[PDB]
Amino acid sequence: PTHADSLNNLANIKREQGNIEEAVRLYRKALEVFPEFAAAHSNLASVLQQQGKLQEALMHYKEAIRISPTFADAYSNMGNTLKEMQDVQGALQCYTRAIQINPAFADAHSNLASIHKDSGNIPEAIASYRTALKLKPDFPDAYCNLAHCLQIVCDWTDYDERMKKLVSIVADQLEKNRLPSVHPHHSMLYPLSHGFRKAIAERHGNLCLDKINVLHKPPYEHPKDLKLSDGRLRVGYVSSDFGNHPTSHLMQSIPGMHNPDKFEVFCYALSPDDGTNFRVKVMAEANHFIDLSQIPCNGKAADRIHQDGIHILVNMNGYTKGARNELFALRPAPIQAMWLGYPGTSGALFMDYIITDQETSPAEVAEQYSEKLAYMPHTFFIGDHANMFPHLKKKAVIDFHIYDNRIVLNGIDLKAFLDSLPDVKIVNMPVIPMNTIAEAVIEMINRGQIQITINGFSISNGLATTQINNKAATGEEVPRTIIVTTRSQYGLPEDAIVYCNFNQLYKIDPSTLQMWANILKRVPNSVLWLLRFPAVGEPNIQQYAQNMGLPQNRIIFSPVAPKEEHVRRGQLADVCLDTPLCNGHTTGMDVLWAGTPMVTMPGETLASRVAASQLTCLGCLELIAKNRQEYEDIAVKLGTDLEYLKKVRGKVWKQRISSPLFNTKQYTMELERLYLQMWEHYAAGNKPDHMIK
């Protein structure tokens, strides 16, 4: 009793000191003296949970709740543990019980909201966050998580005040040395200073440091030359996204394109094999592939990386799902660089470089980054579109004047099919005249038919790819049939300008929708094409649009589509209107591969500048706006000056091939050049510095 209380206190004392193992030892001694000590079980469980020992933490939570049936806090913390163990149902049960025990327990309502949010149930997440905030008005975690929910569904009620409060909260948390409630991956969405955004990231970087310092591992010995590696630079790519994920859709060809005479590629997967061709390709083409998901201990995994003799370790996650930045905090490699996956600074001292470019990250704003800048010569962005979607390299149209984006055909065997037809016109875009063949295609689409056969060739309805070849739909395989894509498939007007944006709706803000409204108003024959991403955002966009004076028929929504259909249907738009708050990144590459011009207005953050970097590499400077007025003028020009539209569309169509934008071999070779710059700098005994020339 009294002795046990003292022991629990000393363990808490030792807990604050940082001596975690002594804390555990003292907690156990308390339990030895007084076994039925709920507080001691709860404290030990929390400590074990922090150490990552989740199963052991669970044991003690179960003890605590039995001894004290009104211990709502224990139920809540046990829920947090189950959530981390990926037992979502169990976590929800614990949060639900905590709320039943204590209806006024604000933290439990917030924790329940987060399960709903992570489960994609936004309206329910919002409801629970609002309850938390009613109980506890001063609740940074709940306020900021609520703000992101509202961002996801484009709820902009009291937006300006909301942003001010968010900045105020972060300013206060940073001042009081606490972990900011705004996630660094979201920090580009709010009007925070660059200083604040880097500071948020730095706080998370310090979390990793605090986790690894308890391992008490010494600094690793790093290689001083390439002698032990036969003159080859050993590059390790670390990612939780080797599989079906945008990251692999961008870079899956890169490991196999490395020059084996000078480079030895190690891919370290943080995720298990998801069975997709994306994972197959990387495992087959990398020199070495290591599944670190089978090695939970960051100490043992870092040891493995160091054993491999990695010279440059590449962080492809930053603060994204599946990341294990503790690996980088342990510094198993002499040079560690951020690349591609994370659109922002790590803020961490254990990351030496960020791989970017002059357009994305001009030297003037180097203070936005904790890392030194390492410039690729054109853009740091890349996409695997030339390999994944080669059927979109060429197109033909059906003329039912002549439009290039009303009824479109694509296929590996498209030329042969066209050769089977009479009266095919060439303008180089092949045009099929309105004949018996053309009526058969329209009939298929209207009847919702999956496919037909013409002259022995397979003609597929573009809306039905999952029923024909699911691997083709996901981008795992190149389609083997000829596909038809039409405006009628999506309810798009045959006689008007189509402006599109295929991003998640969270990237839109009031200023952006107003810009788009001004454009639509200036171009009578035009619609805006958006996605139900998520659907619950649709009525919010429509309401704001109506408030801006746009009837419902000016905005057209489509469901999110399988990967191939998403890229393919971009051919139906005239122009893409990029989101200035946070650009399309993967989605920018997606739209350009379809030959669709994209209007962008680069900001200051990395995430707001990626589209302009893409277009600069592409060779279309005329699509980059310096202000909102210019963005509007460019968009309206493209939608009203039809000869100019044709010119620009023709430019994008040609340049996606002739420019370096989608050239993965050239990209790999430039990446290799940059790697060697980094190494010879280190090899000369120098600390990291900007590589901007």
């Binding site: 981390e84 991956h185 994204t320 996956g341 996901t474 469901p559």
Partner: peptide, 14 residues
């Protein structure tokens, strides 16, 4: 996409 999955960039847990 409805009926399947569309992976996206996701923030890690904190």
């Amino acid at each position: 996409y409805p009926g399947g999955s569309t992976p996206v960039s996701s923030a890690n847990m904190m």
